[PDB]
């Protein structure tokens, strides 16, 4: 029984979630990025890297 592989992108959603209602100074708050396009390996951990040309897109501020 043959099985096909589908190439398809996804819509990302970058969200900043402060630990409280105000982002005061000296408070590290998590940044959550949901992007299936950067998950290029299902058996390992993919870490973004400016030095890695394979990682095409990196968030910036």
């Amino acid at each position: 029984t043959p099985q096909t592989i589908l190439v398809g992108f996804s819509f990302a959603s970058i969200d900043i979630q402060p630990v409280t209602d105000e982002w005061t100074s000296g408070q590290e708050i998590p940044v959550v990025i949901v992007d299936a396009d950067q998950n290029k390996n299902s058996r390992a951990d993919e870490d973004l890297d400016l030095n890695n040309p394979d990682v095409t897109l990196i968030p910036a501020l």
Binding site: T1, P2, Q3, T4, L6
Partner: protein, 72 residues
């Protein structure tokens, strides 16, 4: 459909001893393709999506059926 429906034929030696055939048929009708858009109005770069529901274009229950766009 009706008298022209796809019918499979299979001979058989019955318990009596005659070679009577046994057959079964199932209709394979078509469907009216319906295409519609998610919204009545769209803005610039509103990401319009085309939903086509027509079961006759499925040519394999295993593989994912796709239709590309001609560039020629």
């Amino acid at each position: 459909t009706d008298e022209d429906a796809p019918r499979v034929n299979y001979n058989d030696l019955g318990a009596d001893g005659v070679t009577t055939p046994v057959s079964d048929q199932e209709e394979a009708p078509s469907h009216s393709g319906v295409v519609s858009l998610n919204a009545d109005s769209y803005k610039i770069a509103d990401t319009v999506v085309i939903t086509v529901e027509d079961l006759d274009l499925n040519v394999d229950s295993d593989l994912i059926d796709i239709f590309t766009v001609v560039s020629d």
